Each structure stands twice: as C-alpha cells, then as structure tokens.
Design a protein around this ligand. Structure first.
Ligand code: CHL
Ligand code: CLA
Ligand code: CLA
Ligand code: CLA
Ligand code: CLA
Ligand code: CLA
Ligand SMILES: CC1=C[C@H](O)CC(C)(C)[C@H]1/C=C/C(C)=C/C=C/C(C)=C/C=C/C=C(C)/C=C/C=C(C)/C=C/C1=C(C)C[C@H](O)CC1(C)C
Ligand SMILES: CC1=C[C@H](O)CC(C)(C)[C@H]1/C=C/C(C)=C/C=C/C(C)=C/C=C/C=C(C)/C=C/C=C(C)/C=C/C1=C(C)C[C@H](O)CC1(C)C
Ligand SMILES: CC1=C[C@H](O)CC(C)(C)[C@H]1/C=C/C(C)=C/C=C/C(C)=C/C=C/C=C(C)/C=C/C=C(C)/C=C/C1=C(C)C[C@H](O)CC1(C)C
Ligand SMILES: CC1=C[C@H](O)CC(C)(C)[C@H]1/C=C/C(C)=C/C=C\C(C)=C\C=C\C=C(C)\C=C\C=C(C)\C=C\C1=C(C)C[C@H](O)CC1(C)C
Ligand SMILES: CC1=C(/C=C/C(C)=C/C=C/C(C)=C/C=C\C=C(C)\C=C\C=C(C)\C=C\C2=C(C)C[C@@H](O)CC2(C)C)C(C)(C)CCC1
Ligand SMILES: CC1=C(/C=C/C(C)=C/C=C/C(C)=C/C=C/C=C(C)/C=C/C=C(C)/C=C/C2=C(C)CCCC2(C)C)C(C)(C)CCC1
Lengths: 165, 194, 217, 74, 67, 74, 194
C-alpha cells in the first residue's frame, strides 16, 4: 500500500518464503521415525512457522519485494492505514515501562539520600523501601507532571557545581 | 481596558490600559518589551487597515459579479486584459508592477521616515473626526476592533478557498443552503479523520 | 474513620482535616497520587466530573435498555446507537462533533478558569449580567446557583449526605461503564442480556466461563 | 542477524525510510506513490516548471539506472 | 518592450526613489563632493543607477522568454 | 572607501534579540573573529569540509563530466 | 409586591417592592446583583413588548385566513412572491433583510445608546397615559403581566406546532372539538409512552 509495498497476505515472495522454510524442516523430519522425539520437535516448529506466517499476514503487515514485513513508523500513515501496532503503540508501551524504572530509581535515590549513609544504601539495597516504590511507580506519569508543575523536579543552577569556564 | 479576553484572568502589566484595544491578550508575552510593543502597536493598526481594504475589495468584486478575489489576477497568466467595474484597463503586468513599486516605495518610504506615527491626521483626517480627545478613544477602538475582525475574515477567505476553491460569497451561499452539511468539518481537508 | 481496608495504614495526606472534608474519603490512595495538596484538589475536581458524566451516561444505557427489554422502548444497544442515530440525522458525525467541541470547550474553559481562581467567572461585565450567577459557591466543584434550580444545597443539615450519595453513586456508575465495555468485548451481547443470561445459570454463565477473562484456568 | 541465523528472515525489524521516500516523491520519484509536488501532475510546482527543467529532471529522477535519488528501503 | 525604453525608465525610477525617498534613510543607516542640494554624490548615482539597470534587464529578460 | 556599504561590526552589534534570549547577542564578535586566525581557520575548515562532502554527494548523483558515470572505478 | 408566585414563600430582598410585576419570583437568584437586575428588568419589558406584537400578528394572520405564523416566510424559500393583507409586496428576501437590518440597527442603536430607558415618553407616549405616577404604576403592572402572558403564549405556539405542526387557532379548534382526545398528552410527543 504505502511506499509501493504490498500486503504480506497478497505477496507471492511471502508465500514462497513460508514454503521454503517448511521444506527445510520437512527434509529433516524424514530421517526420523514418526513418534521419535526428534520428529515431534520438528513438527512443533513447523506448526509454529505456519502460525507465524498466518498471524503476521492477519495483522495486516506490508511486505517489500523481498517478501518480508516492513514496519510503518510515521504516526500519520500508521493511524490512517491500520499500522499503529507496529511502532506507535509499542512506543507508548516502552515509554511507560522506561519512565517507570527511572521514576522509581529517582524516588529511591532521593529517599536514601536523607539517611545516615546513602552510599551504604546503594551497595546494600533497602529491599522493603525498594519494593514499596516499585509498586507506587504505576502512577509515575501523573506524579512526574505534578512535580514538573510544582517546580520540584529540577535543581536550582545555584546549587549545581560547574567548571571555571 | 476594552474588556477581558479570558473572563476572570489578570491582564498583563506591560499592556497599558490606555492602549486602544487592550483586552489583556498577550499569552506569548510577545509585547513584554516596550519598544517591541510600540512596533507591534503600529503594525496591528497598519495590518488591520490593509485587511479592511482587502476584505471590502474581496467582497465587492464578487458582490458586483466580477469574479472572486482569487481569480482576479488570472488575466495576466491567461493573456487577457485588466478589468475594473467592467471597464478594461490599458496597462499590463509590467506597467502595473512598475507603477505600484514606485507608488508604494514613495508612500511607505514617506511614512517610515515619519516614525511610528500611527494616527497621522491633518491631510489624512480631512473631515476632522479625531480632532478632539473624547471622540478619539472610541474611534480608535472601533478602528482596531474592525481591523482585527477584517484580518481574521481575510485569513478565513484564504483558508476556506484553499480547502473548497469557492469564493467567500459562494461559500456563504453553500453554508446557508446546508448549514450542517456544508462547513469546515465537511470539507475533507480541515479535519482529516472527520 | 471508615477505611477501604480495615487495619491498613491510612495515608497521612488523606487523614488531614481538609482531606477528611472531602466526600468519599475512605483513605484510599495506595499509589500516593494525592500526596500533593494542589494535585489532590485537581483530582477531586476530576473525580467529580467523571462521576457526574458516568452517572448520566450509564443511566442513558441501562434505563433505556431495561425499558426496551420490557417493550416500553425500542432503543438500539449502546454500542450500536451511534450508527443508528447518525443514519437519519440532519448532520454527519464530524459536523456534530465539531459543534460539540465548540460548545463544550466554552463551558469547560469557564469551569477551568473557576478552578484556577474560584469566583473569577463573576467578573462584573463579563457575561451580560449572568457572571453574577456564574460565581460558584465556597466549595469548588459544587457551583449551585442556576445549577441547583431546587435549592437542595441550601439545607446545611443535608449537605454532607447529598455529596456522599453523589460520590458513591458516581464511583459505582464509573465502574458500571468499565463493566459495560469489558462485558461487551468478552460476550458480544448487551448489559441487560449479560444480566439475564447470568441469572438463568449463574454457576455456569460468568466471567470464569467466558473464555477470555481467565485464559489460565 | 539472530533472526537470519535462526532461519527466520520474516521476523527481522525492517523500518521503512518513509520520511526520506516522501522527500524523494516530492522531488518527482513516483515509485512510492505519495503523489505530491513534482510527483503530482496536477500540482502547481509541477505545472510552473513544466516548460523549464522538470521534463529532463523527471525523466532522470524516474530512471532507476542512474544514481539520481536511488531507491531506498529498510 | 523597447530595450531603450525599459532600461531608461528603470534607471530614472531608482535614481528618483533614491534621491527623494530613501536618501534620508540610507544616510541615517550610513550613520566625492556634490553640488546637489540633497548631497546626492556620484557614488550614490552609480548605486541606484546600477539597481535600475539590473531591474530593467530582468524585465526585458523575462519578457523575452514571452511570459 | 566610497561612503556606501555595511560595517560588519555595526551589523553584528545590531543582532541582539530584544528579549535577552541571546544575552549581548553578537556584541564583541567582530573583534573576536577579526583578531583570531584560529577562529577564522575554524570557520573556513568547517565550511570547506561541508562543501567537500556536498561535492561528493552531487558529483556522483548529478555527474558533470561525460562518460563519468560509466567509469565505476573513477 | 404584585403578589406571591408561591404562597408561603418569602420574597427575595434584592427584589425592590416598587419593582413592577414583583411577585417575589427569583428562585435561581439571578437578579440578586443590582446591575444584573437592572439589565434583566429592561430586557423583560422589551421581550414582553415584542411578544405582545408577535402573538397579536400570529393570531391575526390565521384569523384573517392569511395563513399561520410558521408558513408566513415560505414564499421566500419557494419562488412565491410576498403578500400582506392579500395585497402583494414587491421585495425579495435580500431586500427585506437589508432594509430591516438598517432600520433595526438605527432605532435599536438610539435605544441602546440612551442607557436602558425602559419608559421613554413624548413620541413613545402620545395620548398622555403615563403623565401621572399613580396611573403609571398600574399601567406598568398591566404592561408587564400582559407581556409575560404573551411570552408564554408565543412559546406555547412554537411548542404546539413543534408537536402537532398546526396553527394556534387550528389547535384551539381541534381541542374544542375533542378536549379529551385533543391535548398535549394525546400528541405522542409531550408525554412519552402511551
Ligand atoms: C465517551 C464517548 C463515546 C464513546 C465511548 C463512544 C463509543 C462508540 N461510538 Mg461514538 N462514542 C462516544 C462518543 C460519540 N460518538 C459519536 C458518534 C458515533 C457514531 C456516528 C458512531 C459511533 C460509534 C461508536 C462505537 C464504535 C467505536 C468507534 O467508532 O470508535 C471510536 C470511538 C471512540 C474514540 C470513543 C472513545 C472516546 C474516548 C474514550 C474519550 C476521550 C463505540 C462503542 C459507531 C457505532 O455505533 O458503531 C455501531 C458509530 O457508527 N459514535 C459522537 C458524535 C455524535 C460522539 C460524541 O461524543
Ligand atoms: C518526527 C518527524 C516526522 C516526519 C519527517 C513526518 C513526515 C510526514 N508526516 Mg508526520 N507526524 C509526526 C512526525 C513526522 N512526520 C508526529 C510526531 C506525529 C504525531 C502527531 C505525526 C502525525 C502525522 C499526521 C496526522 C500526518 C502525518 C503525515 C506526514 C506526511 C505528510 C505530512 C507533511 O505534509 O509534512 C510532514 C509532517 C511533519 C514534518 C510533522 C507532523 C505531520 C503533520 C503535522 C501532519 C500534516 C499532514 C498534512 C495533512 C499533509 C498531508 C495531506 C493529506 C495527504 C492528509 C509526511 C511524510 C500526514 C500523512 O501523510 O498522513 C497520511 C498526516 O496526515 N504525520
Ligand atoms: C535512577 C536511575 C537513573 C536515572 C533516573 C537516570 C536518568 C538519566 N540518565 Mg542515567 N545512568 C544510570 C542511572 C540512571 N539514569 C546508571 C546506573 C548509569 C551507569 C551506567 C547511568 C549512566 C548514564 C549515562 C552515560 C548517561 C545517562 C544519561 C541520563 C539522562 C538521559 C536519559 C537517559 O536515561 O539516558 C540513558 C541512561 C542509561 C542508558 C543508563 C541505564 C541505567 C539503568 C537502566 C537504570 C537503573 C538504575 C538502578 C539500577 C535502579 C535502582 C532502583 C532502586 C529501586 C534500587 C537521564 C536524566 C545520559 C545523559 O546524561 O543525558 C543527558 C547519559 O549520557 N545515564
Ligand atoms: C427574557 C425574558 C425574561 C426576563 C429577562 C425576565 C426578567 C426578570 N423577571 Mg421574568 N418572566 C418571564 C420572562 C422574563 N423575565 C416570563 C415569560 C414570565 C411568565 C412565566 C415571567 C414571570 C416573572 C415573575 C412572576 C417574576 C419575574 C421576575 C423577573 C425579574 C427578577 C430577576 C430575575 O428573575 O432574574 C433574571 C431573569 C432572567 C435572567 C430571565 C432570563 C431568561 C432565563 C434566565 C434564561 C433561560 C430561561 C429558561 C429557558 C427557562 C425559560 C422557560 C422555559 C419554559 C423555556 C427579572 C428582571 C420577578 C420580578 O420581580 O419581576 C419584577 C417576578 O416576580 N418574571
Ligand atoms: C413584530 C410584529 C410583527 C411582525 C414581525 C410581522 C411580520 C409579518 N406579518 Mg404581521 N401583523 C402584526 C405584527 C407583525 N407582523 C400585527 C400586530 C398585526 C395586526 C394588524 C399584523 C397583521 C398582519 C396581516 C394581516 C398580515 C401580516 C403579514 C406578515 C408577514 C408579511 C410581512 C409584510 O409584508 O408586512 C408588510 C409591511 C408593511 C405594510 C410596512 C408597513 C409597516 C408600518 C411601519 C406600519 C410578515 C412575516 C401578512 C402575512 O401573513 O403574509 C401572508 C399578512 O397578511 N401581518
Ligand atoms: C396561555 C398559555 C397556553 C394556552 C392557553 C394553551 C392552550 C392549548 N394548548 Mg398549549 N402550550 C403552552 C401554553 C398554552 N397552551 C406552553 C407554554 C407550552 C410549552 C410547554 C405548550 C405546549 C403545548 C403542546 C405540545 C400542545 C398544546 C396544546 C394546546 C391546546 C390543547 C390543550 C393543551 O394540551 O394544552 C397544553 C399546555 C400546557 C399543559 C401548558 C390548547 C388550545 C395541544 C394541542 O395542540 O391540542 C390540539 C398540544 O399538543 N400546548
Ligand atoms: C496578538 C497575539 C499575542 C499573543 O501573545 C499570541 C498570539 C496568539 C500569537 C498573537 C496573535 C496573533 C494573530 C492572531 C495574528 C493574526 C494576524 C492576521 C490574520 C493578519 C491578516 C492580515 C491580512 C491582511 C493585511 C490582508 C490584506 C489584503 C489586501 C491588502 C488586499 C488583497 C487583495 C484584494 C483587495 C482583492 C484582489 O483580487 C486580490 C488581493 C490583491 C489579494
Ligand atoms: C481616516 C479618514 C479621514 C476623513 O476625515 C473621514 C473619513 C474619510 C471617514 C476617514 C476614512 C475612513 C475609511 C477609509 C474607512 C474604511 C473603512 C473600511 C473599508 C472598513 C472595513 C471593514 C471590514 C470588515 C470589518 C470585514 C468583516 C468581514 C467579515 C466579518 C467576513 C465574514 C465572512 C467570512 C470570513 C467568509 C464567508 O465565506 C463569508 C462572510 C460571511 C462574508
Ligand atoms: C482512586 C485510585 C488511587 C490509587 O492511588 C490508584 C488507583 C487504584 C489507580 C486509583 C483508582 C482509580 C480507578 C478505579 C479509576 C476508574 C476510573 C473509571 C472506571 C472511570 C469511568 C469513567 C466513565 C465515564 C466518564 C463514562 C462516560 C459515558 C458516557 C458519556 C456515555 C456515552 C454514550 C451513551 C449514554 C449511550 C450511547 O449509545 C453511546 C455512548 C456515546 C457511549
Ligand atoms: C424570571 C426567572 C428568574 C428565576 O431565577 C428562574 C428562571 C425560571 C430561570 C427565570 C425565568 C425566565 C423565563 C421563564 C423566561 C420564559 C419565557 C419566554 C417565552 C420568553 C419569550 C419571549 C418571546 C418573544 C419575545 C417572541 C417574540 C416574537 C416576535 C417579535 C414575532 C414573531 C413572528 C410574527 C409577528 C409573525 C411572523 O409570521 C413570524 C414571526 C416573525 C416569527
Ligand atoms: C519523568 C521521567 C524522567 C524524564 C525527565 C526529563 C526532564 C526528560 C526531558 C525531556 C525533554 C526536555 C524533551 C525535549 C524535547 C522533546 C521533544 C521535542 C520530543 C520529540 C519526540 C518526537 C518528535 C516524536 C517522535 C515519534 C512519536 C510520535 C512516537 C513514535 O511513533 C516514534 C516517532 C519518532 C515517529 C526521568 C527523570 C528521566 C526518569 C524517568 C521518568
Ligand atoms: C545632476 C542634476 C540632474 C540629473 C541629471 C541626470 C540625468 C542624472 C542621471 C545619471 C545616470 C544616467 C545614472 C545612471 C546610472 C546607471 C548605472 C550606473 C548602470 C549600471 C549597470 C549595471 C551595474 C549592470 C550590470 C549587469 C551587466 C553588466 C550584465 C547583465 C546583468 C546586469 C544588468 C546586472 C537634475 C536635472 C535632476 C537636477 C539638476 C542637476
């Protein structure tokens, strides 16, 4: 559709690749008796291969002349043409998890900083406190906005060290 | 102050209450510096005065059945002849460009040297309206408000044309004929997913 | 002190007298979202608007649905009603939404500015004499005035009870809408059918037997 | 590399250079079907330069044997 | 377009605008004795005169392209 | 020498955003550049180096010499 | 106090006793602020005066068999010409729109610039009538009550037509013909179900 690509569902190269892959697995399945554990394993890989080629096509992925799925990363083209589960949604999923890790770690460092030996709490992890922050990190995005709006997220330049210039 | 753009908000301190057309609207704080505000005050009035002439002209041509403001200059790129109120104009693009350049260079040049003079008066106020101070405030407000509305109208004239290709009067006609079926939300350009 | 979990430690930010003045305060903020007072005030406004919208919408899905189930009505299922209504409307959906955003944005902006500075919308000369009524009350999120035509908020001996019923009925209607969405995706039927089907065989007709909610069992 | 090694080339991440292909379309290349500017025969940018360089340029940018805006992919 | 007419008129126009319109602004921006009352020296003539020639040839050049 | 033209120092000194976003703007930069051969060499190299890459990108995509695109080695 | 709209209720103090039509009815506390009450007072009289002319002419046309108030403008929407008392009026909608706009803007502008004068005089009060305050008070009460009645009447006409699509006199005939068969509860619109 976009970029002159073609649905994997209608690509002939996509179909030939699936046959090529299953024919390698079948050429090997022969040297073994039907119930032999080797045979069972090659069969389960063949079933997994058939499901992948079918699942990828059903997801409406586009395929290039190579017969391989290409991912659409433009938010505009992805939303208008049904390709948002390829890069857009993954982006907000990762950003949530990555911010989760960052906000929890920042909250931990801030908590241990007011202790007697912060350095000790960095080599020996205060597990109970760490677990508490780990659970409270689900609402980090709203907490990060509320900190950004109170002006408590950043540090005053006057309190940050710098070189002579 | 003329009023408040956002009821219950605080008007910026840099905007003088005497400034004609002050509604406290400077959310970008673009006029926080006094010299910048002085230029912006002259440019709003100038832009408004051109816009008002433009919108009046854009409407007249179509209302008098001479075409729309957009198709006005096509005669030059169609190898035709200039027309005004029907009368054919003897000059051509070359002559128009030269006459205008000289005319605009002279006038604007004369005004530029005079400085930020926004309200010249004298030869420019022959019937003597803004001679006093009492009439002045209201008359300058009416000028700035009508200029702001015309600037917005002209913008509308361009945006609507770019999306529909119709003249302002022709678009009014379609909206009046089918109000809910003929608007920006039905164009297919203003809101892509609508 | 009523507690969402008897014996649990109530957050100190929900035990503060101002927080206790809030309706529906059962000490529930396990994620600590309202520790900051200024945020707690915004979230209280947000909870009130969600409660009042969910109550109106859920009433507009259940009440018509039960009446249709009886016969007094022939309303389409909530998830099919948009298509049915737009089918014979005077306007396409896009035009109807554009008009909605304009009218909602205007009244939403006035409510917003009232949160930023309570009483600001009474700015004299701002609304052809109506600004006087546009000033709310001493309690944010409870405008009263024209919004309380029968003056029920004027009875101080009943004020607290009325607000608790609004918050509890609102929290229930918010969960009833989430239930309507989840049940639609897991059943392919409407909330009134889901109710009748379960009541016929509750031990074999439930989310444990829907083949979606519990993909492990 | 791991997807190629495990014999699953259909599982590799292949992001299309849409932003660059859109620019190439703007310059005239129609292979991507974006249809705009020099790639659109009903565009003003197309008509204004039709009696000047566009003809020779479009012939060259649409020839996939030279090095003028080579085709690009993942 | 008569070559002699276009250029001749073009040069005169720029010389005039530079002698009665932008002379003050240029002088202010500027922050060969001329007996000209407005002090229009030869170098000033060369400048505006050049501008006129360029604009004139441009008009003739595009006109020669016939559109 | 003829009374007309721009004074680079005056140009730079005038380029100061009115909001103070760039501090004193380009004040003192005339003398900074005019008295520093290293500053002058830094600009020349940065400009010539960028121009050299443009030559590489344009000469291969728009070959200016006859029978150059067929000489793959060259 | 012309009376108590709700017996047993106390009148809002902000409502002046002399205020004509003061039945102590401001349940939503809209006239509590003096400025607001001032504007609403003038607006209420204006609305009543306009409605009293609208109801009159809405009933007259139908009574004179010239049609109903709702079908009076359809001549413009169709190719029909304009008629009045049967006599034909030679004007297109566009002419009427422009003529009314200028006329209304002029008279309304004078009224507006005056400053909320609800009760002028001389030209607006020939035939004396409001020269003595004693008569003026009762005459002001009669104007507001007749005006409020006419405002409820017009809304009734619009609502009845929206539910039945018939003229006000035509309804009065249907109801009188079958009161228990012809009423708001028997239209399938006012009362749902049934
Ligand atoms: C909370 C509001 C809201 C919700 C939850 C829904 C939900 C739905 N609408 Mg609906 N709508 C809503 C508002 C509106 N609709 C319409 C006009 C229509 C039409 C004309 C149609 C629907 C349809 C639908 C259904 C199909 C989903 C869809 O088209 O994806 C988009 C849905 C959303 C983006 C809703 C999510 C909103 C978000 C959570 C708020 C932030 C779906 C269950 C379709 C239907 O009935 O299919 C049979 C349909 O044809 N809606 C208008 C403008 C008049 C709305 C204005 O607010
Ligand atoms: C970050 C770099 C980047 C780049 C290089 C592009 C590039 C492009 N985008 Mg885009 N986009 C981006 C980020 C980017 N986007 C982000 C972060 C978002 C989230 C809001 C979007 C949302 C978006 C939408 C909704 C659309 C595009 C579209 C497009 C294509 C045409 C847009 C255009 O005219 O100019 C380039 C655009 C940008 C430089 C910035 C954002 C795109 C603008 C805001 C959209 C305006 C599109 C306009 C209607 C032109 C297309 C007309 C018609 C075909 C719809 C183009 C190849 C249009 C498209 O082709 O859809 C089929 C489309 O409608 N993008
Ligand atoms: C609380 C943990 C934490 C947080 C919030 C941040 C945040 C940040 N780091 Mg960073 N960093 C960390 C740990 C952390 N770092 C550690 C442990 C290292 C040693 C490898 C570094 C090394 C590092 C470098 C070299 C750089 C940053 C940079 C940055 C900034 C740019 C965004 C970025 O993340 O780049 C990416 C950061 C990384 C890829 C480092 C990954 C660190 C892991 C994933 C974090 C795990 C922390 C800890 C184990 C969790 C404890 C939890 C607690 C409950 C026990 C950003 C503000 C960049 C910058 O300065 O931009 C302005 C930069 O160049 N960091
Ligand atoms: C635009 C029409 C209009 C306006 C401006 C007023 C204005 C006023 N009325 Mg009045 N009234 C009206 C129509 C109107 N009335 C009609 C049609 C009736 C007959 C039912 C009455 C019967 C009535 C009584 C008995 C009394 C008043 C009184 C008053 C004054 C008290 C102050 C006040 O109530 O707040 C301001 C009022 C308004 C702002 C009205 C504006 C219109 C509303 C607020 C907008 C929405 C209305 C809504 C659509 C409901 C309409 C009815 C519905 C069926 C459609 C005030 C100046 C009291 C008084 O002291 O009079 C001297 C009083 O005793 N009115
Ligand atoms: C604000 C009050 C008002 C308004 C807006 C209208 C409006 C209208 N009337 Mg009406 N009318 C009114 C009061 C009003 N009337 C009253 C109080 C009476 C009782 C005498 C009538 C009796 C009346 C009759 C008998 C007829 C109308 C008709 C009409 C329609 C044709 C208008 C026309 O050409 O008139 C003509 C304009 C003039 C004569 C200008 C003279 C006005 C000067 C100032 C007096 C029009 C929509 C006609 C109609 O229904 O169309 C089929 C029609 O036959 N009216
Ligand atoms: C002085 C006020 C007044 C008067 C005398 C009437 C008189 C009449 N109305 Mg009416 N009406 C009024 C106000 C009035 N209405 C108002 C304010 C509304 C809006 C709520 C309506 C809405 C209305 C409707 C929808 C209908 C009538 C109808 C009627 C007729 C039958 C009785 C009835 O159903 O009344 C109802 C009025 C009220 C209950 C109030 C009758 C001649 C019915 C009709 O047309 O019968 C043929 C009809 O269906 N009215
Ligand atoms: C204030 C503020 C501040 C804060 O802070 C922020 C913000 C918001 C940013 C800001 C705002 C801004 C804005 C809105 C602006 C706008 C503008 C405009 C629209 C203009 C126009 C403007 C416009 C104008 C002048 C117009 C003009 C026109 C003219 C002359 C004429 C024309 C014409 C005519 C006759 C007709 C023909 O056939 C054609 C032509 C030739 C075409
Ligand atoms: C100084 C002087 C001196 C002496 O002494 C005296 C005297 C003479 C008086 C003076 C002069 C003056 C003047 C010249 C004035 C002018 C004015 C104007 C023109 C305005 C406009 C003004 C104008 C304006 C506002 C405009 C407006 C517009 C608008 C709203 C628009 C609307 C629309 C749109 C958008 C679109 C669609 O589709 C259609 C429509 C619907 C159409
Ligand atoms: C508190 C806390 C704290 C800690 O810290 C943490 C945590 C736990 C996280 C938190 C929790 C939270 C939660 C639970 C939330 C939930 C929410 C919701 C559910 C909402 C809804 C919400 C909901 C809502 C608004 C709703 C709305 C609705 C509506 C409008 C309706 C509409 C409609 C109807 C009528 C019918 C048609 O046919 C259709 C439609 C169109 C559809
Ligand atoms: C007081 C109060 C206070 C407290 O607070 C509460 C509340 C309750 C809120 C308030 C209330 C208010 C109200 C009730 C209002 C109502 C009603 C109305 C109806 C008005 C109208 C009013 C109405 C009106 C003016 C009307 C008018 C009309 C007119 C001129 C005219 C018409 C017509 C005619 C002749 C004939 C033709 O063919 C057509 C036409 C042209 C169509
Ligand atoms: C709250 C949080 C943290 C973050 C702290 C801070 C201060 C982060 C700073 C963010 C800043 C200053 C960003 C500045 C500019 C960012 C800009 C201009 C955004 C660029 C994004 C663009 C253009 C989007 C690109 C696309 C979108 C729509 C999504 C995908 O489709 C992919 C793509 C590229 C197409 C801490 C402490 C690291 C801890 C953790 C949680
Ligand atoms: C003194 C006086 C006078 C006047 C006189 C005169 C007449 C003057 C003029 C003079 C002149 C007569 C001037 C002119 C100048 C010109 C110039 C100086 C030109 C130059 C040229 C150029 C620079 C060109 C270049 C080029 C080429 C070569 C090639 C192509 C391209 C171009 C065109 C660009 C009067 C009477 C008023 C008064 C008294 C005294």
């Amino acid at each position: 559709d976009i970029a002159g690509l073609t649905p994997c569902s209608e690509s002939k190269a996509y179909a030939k690749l699936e046959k090529k892959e299953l024919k390698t697995l079948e050429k090997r399945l022969k040297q073994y008796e039907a119930d032999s554990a080797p045979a069972v394993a090659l069969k389960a890989t063949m079933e997994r291969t058939k499901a992948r080629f079918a699942n990828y096509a059903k997801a409406g992925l586009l395929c290039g002349n190579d017969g391989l799925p290409h991912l659409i990363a433009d938010p505009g083209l992805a939303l208008k043409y049904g390709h948002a589960g390829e890069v857009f949604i993954p982006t907000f999923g990762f950003l949530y998890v990555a911010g989760y890790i960052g906000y929890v770690g920042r909250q931990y460092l801030i908590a241990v900083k007011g202790e007697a030996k912060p350095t000790d709490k960095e080599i020996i992890i205060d597990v109970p406190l760490a677990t508490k922050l780990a659970w409270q990190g689900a609402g980090w995005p709203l907490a990060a906005v509320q900190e950004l709006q109170r002006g408590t997220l950043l540090e005053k330049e006057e309190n940050i060290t710098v070189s002579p210039r | 102050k003329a009023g408040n753009w956002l009821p219950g908000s605080d008007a910026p301190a840099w905007l003088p209450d005497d400034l004609p057309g002050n509604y406290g609207f400077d959310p970008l704080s673009l006029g926080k510096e006094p010299a910048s505000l002085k230029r912006f005050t002259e440019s709003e009035v100038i832009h408004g005065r051109w816009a008002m002439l433009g919108v009046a002209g854009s409407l007249a041509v179509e209302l008098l059945g001479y075409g729309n403001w957009y198709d006005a200059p096509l005669w030059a790129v169609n190898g035709g002849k200039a027309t005004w109120f029907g009368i054919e104009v003897p000059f051509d693009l070359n002559a128009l460009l030269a006459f205008e350049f000289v005319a605009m260079a002279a006038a604007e040049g004369q005004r530029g040297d005079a400085g930020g003079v926004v309200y010249p008066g004298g030869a420019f106020d022959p019937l003597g309206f803004a001679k006093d101070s009492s009439k002045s405030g209201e008359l300058k407000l009416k000028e700035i408000k009508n200029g702001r509305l015309a600037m917005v109208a002209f913008l509308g004239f361009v945006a609507q044309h770019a999306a529909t290709g119709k003249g302002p009067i022709a678009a009014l006609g379609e909206h009046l004929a089918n109000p809910w079926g003929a608007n920006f939300a039905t164009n297919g350009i203003s809101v892509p997913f609508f | 002190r009523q507690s969402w979990l008897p014996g649990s430690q109530i957050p100190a930010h929900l035990d503060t007298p101002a927080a206790q003045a809030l309706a529906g305060n059962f000490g529930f903020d396990p994620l600590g979202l309202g520790k900051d007072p200024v945020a707690l005030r915004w979230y209280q406004q947000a909870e009130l608007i969600h409660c009042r919208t969910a109550m109106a919408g859920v009433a507009g899905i259940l009440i018509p649905g039960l009446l249709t189930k009886a016969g007094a009505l022939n309303v389409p299922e909530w998830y099919d009603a948009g298509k049915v209504a737009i089918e014979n409307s005077f306007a396409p959906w896009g035009s109807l939404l554009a008009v909605q955003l304009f009218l909602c944005g205007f009244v939403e902006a006035k409510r917003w500015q009232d949160i930023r500075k309570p009483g600001s919308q009474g700015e004299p000369g701002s609304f052809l004499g109506f600004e006087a009524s546009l000033k709310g009350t001493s309690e944010l999120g409870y405008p009263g005035g024209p919004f309380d035509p029968l003056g029920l908020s004027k009875e101080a001996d009943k004020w607290a009870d009325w607000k608790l019923k609004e918050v509890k009925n609102g929290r229930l209607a918010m969960l009833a809408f989430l239930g309507f969405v989840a049940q639609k995706y897991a059943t392919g039927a409407g909330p009134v059918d889901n109710l009748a089907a379960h009541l016929k065989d509750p031990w074999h007709v439930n989310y444990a037997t829907n083949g979606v909610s519990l993909p492990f069992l | 590399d791991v997807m190629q090694a495990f014999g699953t080339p259909e599982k590799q991440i292949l992001i299309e250079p849409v932003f660059a292909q859109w620019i190439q379309a703007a310059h005239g290349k129609a292979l991507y079907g974006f249809d705009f500017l020099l790639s659109s025969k009903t565009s003003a940018a197309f008509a204004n330069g039709q009696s000047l360089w566009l003809p020779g340029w479009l012939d060259a940018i649409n020839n996939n044997q030279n090095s003028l805006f080579l085709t690009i992919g993942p | 377009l008569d070559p002699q007419i276009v250029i001749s008129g073009s040069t005169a126009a720029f010389l005039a605008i530079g002698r009665f319109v932008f002379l003050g602004y240029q002088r202010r921006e500027a922050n060969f004795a001329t007996n000209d009352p407005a002090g229009f020296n030869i170098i000033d003539v060369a400048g505006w005169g050049a501008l006129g020639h360029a604009v004139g040839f441009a008009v003739l050049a595009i006109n020669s392209l016939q559109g | 020498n003829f009374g007309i033209g721009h004074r680079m120092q005056a140009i730079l000194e005038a380029h100061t955003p009115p909001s103070g976003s760039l501090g004193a703007g380009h004040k003192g930069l005339f003398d900074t550049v005019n008295n520093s051969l290293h500053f002058q060499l830094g600009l020349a190299l940065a400009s010539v180096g960028t121009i050299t890459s443009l030559v590489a990108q344009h000469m291969y995509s728009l070959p200016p010499y006859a029978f150059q695109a067929i000489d793959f080695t060259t």
